[PDB]
Amino acid sequence: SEIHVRISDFPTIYSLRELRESNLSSLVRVTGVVTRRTGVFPQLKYVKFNCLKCGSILGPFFQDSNEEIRISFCTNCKSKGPFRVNGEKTVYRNYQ
Amino acid sequence: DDVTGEKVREAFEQFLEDFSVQSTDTGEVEKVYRAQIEFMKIYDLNTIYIDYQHLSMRENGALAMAISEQYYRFLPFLQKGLRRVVRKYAPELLNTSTERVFQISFFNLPTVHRIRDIRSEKIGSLLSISGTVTRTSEVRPELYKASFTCDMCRAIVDNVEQSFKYTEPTFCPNPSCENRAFWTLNVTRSRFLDWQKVRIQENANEIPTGSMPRTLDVILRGDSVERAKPGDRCKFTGVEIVVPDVTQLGLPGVKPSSTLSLGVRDLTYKISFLACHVISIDQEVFLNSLS
Amino acid sequence: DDVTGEKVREAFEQFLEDFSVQSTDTGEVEKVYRAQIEFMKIYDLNTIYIDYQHLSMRENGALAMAISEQYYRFLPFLQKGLRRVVRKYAPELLNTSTERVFQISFFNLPTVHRIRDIRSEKIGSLLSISGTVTRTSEVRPELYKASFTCDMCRAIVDNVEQSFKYTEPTFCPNPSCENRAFWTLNVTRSRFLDWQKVRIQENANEIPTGSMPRTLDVILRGDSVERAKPGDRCKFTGVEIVVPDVTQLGLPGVKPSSTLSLGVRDLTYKISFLACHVISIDQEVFLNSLS
Ligand SMILES: [Zn+2]
Ligand SMILES: [Zn+2]
Ligand SMILES: [Zn+2]
């Protein structure tokens, strides 16, 4: 469904303790030794919220990776109750 | 408004602007401060070294006494004064290329007070404390200037500077809102300051007879972060600040409280220290350092 | 969009300029539509009278038949074509001095329909009727274009078209809003026209044997309001129109109904008329209207 681009050979290399804050929202190239893995966890990618007041499920809304979007109002029927997720129709992504 | 704060701020501006002294036998009379302004501009640094004796000689020490005794209130006034000084002389480095948060790191204070000698009256004042670095934290970003997105009348508004407690803008880009429901921060537009909490022990020589080494937690911000070494004797200069404490609720003695519908907040604190200047107490490098 | 609508609109605006009826011996030939446009600019009126005979003459009357059979469908195209023609020649009168509504009135239809001749297959078409005015109502405003105040991000959307029924602006003054649940209308940015309902009645000479008189409700929109006193025989020219009726709930015959959820709605209507204009049938003004 989607494609990704993997940048390589960035000029500047910073150690972990030298990140400070100027490198915020910036591309960095750091090196280290891996310590802990958290396994492979599915993460919501194309979540389809359902509207039980409408009758059926709503459209697939792209889930921003910063935070979990919510259906406060249904733009169609103004439903405050149903904003749940159906794990069958939802398309997930890997996460570690 | 406060007349005294503004008057002291402008007096500080004037004293900095007209600072004069003979420089040794060579360099004649050098405005060391005004010239060092552009000296640090060359590297676009963020620290301004205010030696205490300079501030102390002028106005028979009244300016130094005012700054030391009530540093917490005066510090923003001094920041505005420094910005005005940059505006008048050497305005080429003000922009970050928003504006660099220049650090005023005082030093060469008269006396250094031990951890055991910390007192509750001198909070809000400027002093130096000497101790041993035992535990240091990570360089975690601290929210200083934030960008808030209003739940209502949605938009992006920056320059809502963060205070010690959380602060959100009451005025909105669309004024009809005047509501503060879910003002949302954003990564790309908010401004942050480097932060570090270092734990220090009391030095062995200054330990009282039959007592344990009293400890203290010191906050490091700006370019002074990640300077101390665990087990390295260091001196810290700055202001004593109080931080909320949720542990000392069951201790004996009455507790501070408020009433405003109970309208009551359990008020307890523990004393910490916000520091500005910290120092540690190829053969060419060592040779260069060698006199 | 529709290709046929574009074709009819471009032909309309084409012959608003290219048409020119002869003046016989006295006056050679002149652009009658352009002459009427100059008259419009001179008197700053708001309605243009177009003879149907000329349209029938032009292009073997195919366009005349098309506009007579489906007047309602092509009406916005007619308005757009007239606006572009006005822009071409004498565009000064385009604006009110926000925007001035131009009214198109067709006169001298080939045939005259009596009130009893109303048929469903003529609904939405152009025709003429002749009746006697019985009841006239007050000249009241109607929402030509309607503006509203937003619910979330409270603000006013400006100059949105209002259809035959209540409408909600899909777009918002704040593009990020996209909320339309609660709109609060503002009269300032809402256009209006003149509305007046006249109840005409069938003339005596047209009544069949035994039938009691039949009557129709005619709506006069525009400058034609209060143009006829009660008890006068007038000729009405306009478009056959339908209006929803809730009274015919128990009548024989299956009631058309729409299902959507449920989305139930009874589709019961009664026939009315929307007349473009009305024609009735000191000594100086009197002396003028004589040969
Ligand atoms: Zn819904
Ligand atoms: Zn707001
Ligand atoms: Zn809105």
Interface residue of C149, C152, C154 to substitute, partner B, most B CBs within 10 Å: C154
C179 touches chain B (CB under 8 A): no
Q: Report helix angle C71-88 to C3-18, nearest 10.
A: 50
Query: Does B135 fall in a domain?
Result: yes
Residues B43 and B125 both lie in one domain: no
Residues C119 and C171 both lie in one domain: no
Backbone φ and ψ of C265, nearest 5°: -160, 120
Alpha carbon C238 to its chain's center: 7
Q: Report d(CA C106, CA C51) in Å as an integer.
A: 6
CB distance C196 to C140 below 8 Å: yes
Residues C151 and C117 both lie in one domain: no
Contacts (Cβ under 8 Å, ≥6 apart) of C95: none
CB distance C199 to C135 below 8 Å: yes
Residues C116 and C104 both lie in one domain: no
Residues B36 and B79 both lie in one domain: yes
Q: For residue C153, give the ligand nearest its CA.
A: 3
Backbone φ and ψ of B226, nearest 5°: 55, 40
H or E stretch including C284? helix C283-288
End residue of a domain, out of C166, C193, C220: C193
In terms of CA atoms, which chain B residue is nearest residue A19? B139
User: Would you call B202 exposed, middle or buried from its count of C-beta atoms within 10 A (0-12, 13-18, 19+)?
Assistant: buried
Residues C146 and C134 both lie in one domain: no
3-state SS string over C28-84?
Answer: CEECHHHHHHHHHHHHCCCEEEEEHHHHHHHHHHHHHHHHHHCHHHHHHHHHHHHHH
CB contact under 8 A, C181 and A55: no
Residues C65 and C182 both lie in one domain: no
- Which DSSP state fits C263? -
- Which DSSP state fits A22? T
Structure tokens at B258: 């408020």
Q: In chain B, which residues have their Cβ closer than 8 Å to the Cβ of A21?
A: 139, 141, 192-194
Query: Does C261 fall in a domain?
Result: no
Q: How many domains does chain C have?
A: 3
Chains that touch A (3 or more CB pairs under 8 A): B, C
User: Would you call B229 exposed, middle or buried from its count of C-beta atoms within 10 A (0-12, 13-18, 19+)?
Assistant: exposed
H or E stretch including C181? none
Residues C73 and C26 both lie in one domain: yes
Q: How far is the CA of B179 from the centre of ligand 2 (A)?
A: 5
CB contact under 8 A, B192 and A19: no
Domain with residue B33: its CATH number is 3.30.1640.10
Q: For residue C182, give the ligand nearest its CA.
A: 3
3-state SS string over chain B?
Answer: CCHHHHHHHHHHHHHHHCCCCECCCCCCECCHHHHHHHHHHHCCCCEEEEEHHHHHHHHHHHHHHHHHHCHHHHHHHHHHHHHHHHHHCCCCCCECCCECCCEEEEECCCCEECCCCCCCCCCCCEEEEEEEEEEECCCEEEEEEEEEECCCCCCCEEEEECCCCCCCCCCCCCCCCCCCCCCECCCCCCEEEEEEEEEEECCCCCCCCCCCCCEEEEEEEHHHCCCCCCCCEEEEEEEEEEEECCCCCCCCCCCCCCCCCCCCCCCCEEEEEEEEEEEECCHHHHHHHCC
Q: How was this structure determined?
A: cryo-EM
Domain with residue B122: its CATH number is 2.40.50.140
Residues C117 and C233 both lie in one domain: yes
Rg (CA), chain B: 22
Query: Does B256 fall in a domain?
Result: no
Q: In chain B, which residues have their Cβ closer than 8 Å to the Cβ of C174?
A: 153-155, 174
Q: Report d(CA B232, CA B134) in Å as an integer.
A: 8
CA angle B283, B284, B290 (to 5 degrees): 90
Query: Does C262 fall in a domain?
Result: no
Residues B8 and B69 both lie in one domain: yes
Residues B56 and B8 both lie in one domain: yes
Contacts (Cβ under 8 Å, ≥6 apart) of A26: none
Q: What is the resolution of this structure in A?
A: 3.8
Query: Does C236 fall in a domain?
Result: yes
Interface residue of C150, C152, C153, C172 to substitute, partner B, most B CBs within 10 Å: C153
Query: Does B252 fall in a domain?
Result: no
Range of the domain at C184: 141-193
Chain A nearest CA to C181, separation (Å): 8
Q: Report d(CA B274, CA B112) in Å as an integer.
A: 15
Q: In chain B, which residues have their Cβ closer than 8 Å to the Cβ of C177?
A: 154
Residues C208 and C223 both lie in one domain: yes
Q: Report d(CA C174, CA C157) in Å as an integer.
A: 9
Backbone φ and ψ of C225, nearest 5°: -70, 145
Query: Does B84 fall in a domain?
Result: yes
Q: In chain C, which residues have their Cβ closer than 8 Å to the Cβ of A75?
A: 178-179
Query: Does C250 fall in a domain?
Result: no
Q: Report d(CA A87, CA B183) in Å as an integer.
A: 31
SS3 C88: helix
Q: Pick from C164, C142, C155: which is nearest to C186 by CA?
A: C155
